[PDB]
């Protein structure tokens, strides 16, 4: 009944449309098992959120680089930041791994044991780490505006918007990597070059995508 990825084909039995952004897309049956599907749902949500942040940051920095603001490209921002400011790269790596390890370990053990991080062993906080659903950690900290604890229909609509935007952002990040590997310039530079002449400045004329061209 619901729209699927490939029209005419029935959706798989393990995808009944309950999850957000369900289009029956699983030809390899990777998420056929329920626990594996739950783990993959959390993985897809984390991937989409990280890709959304990365895409927004890349677009903003590219916007600042195109106008005379002095911003660097996304493929040179790390070197520019580490060299412009007296910042030690291994120290930053260790700090990020410490913070990410704490947050990810708490999320992991909450996935293994739901609601286990709400006991209060972390500075006395209880309701802020209870977790609403799998991959959707509601509370006053992660959701200070309370958009997940009011107007259930709007919450489901926002869930669909989030998963679709995350998938689009993942595709956008892959496009950024491929565009830099092929053209060698920034994403907005590619967009401007395409807008200047769309019939002759594309992937069919870059000389890398189609080798027989």
């Amino acid at each position: 009944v619901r729209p699927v990825w490939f029209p005419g084909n029935p959706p798989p039995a393990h995808l009944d449309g309950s999850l957000a952004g369900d289009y029956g897309f699983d030809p390899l049956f990777l998420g056929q098992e329920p626990q594996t599907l739950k783990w993959y749902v959390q993985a897809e949500l984390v991937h989409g959120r990280f890709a959304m942040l990365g895409a927004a940051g890349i677009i903003l920095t590219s916007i600042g680089a195109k106008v005379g603001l002095g911003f660097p490209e996304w493929y040179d921002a790390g070197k520019v930041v580490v060299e412009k400011n007296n910042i030690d790269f291994p120290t930053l790596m260790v700090i990020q791994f410490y913070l990410m390890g704490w947050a990810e370990t708490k999320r992991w053990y909450d996935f293994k044991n739901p609601g286990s991080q709400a006991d209060g062993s972390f500075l006395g906080f209880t309701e802020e780490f209870k977790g609403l659903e799998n991959g959707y950690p509601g509370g006053r900290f992660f959701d200070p505006m309370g958009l997940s604890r009011g107007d259930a229909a709007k919450y489901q609509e926002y869930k669909q918007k989030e998963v679709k935007n995350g998938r689009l952002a993942m595709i956008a990040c892959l496009g950024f990597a491929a565009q830099y590997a092929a053209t060698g310039k920034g994403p907005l530079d590619n967009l401007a070059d395409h807008l200047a002449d769309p019939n002759h400045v594309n992937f069919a004329t870059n000389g890398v995508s189609i080798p027989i061209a």
Binding site: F29, L30, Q32, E33, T36
Partner: protein, 39 residues
């Protein structure tokens, strides 16, 4: 998927993956630490 994982859990597949992992670890150790004779 359950049957596929069970097939991957069989003795030849497990032995192949384990020996590939062990061989890769020894090869990488000898690559980053060439010619180790004594401790």
């Amino acid at each position: 998927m359950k049957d596929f994982t069970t097939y991957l859990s069989t003795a030849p597949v497990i032995a192949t993956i384990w020996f590939t992992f062990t061989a890769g670890l020894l090869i990488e150790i000898n690559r980053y630490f060439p010619d180790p004779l004594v401790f």
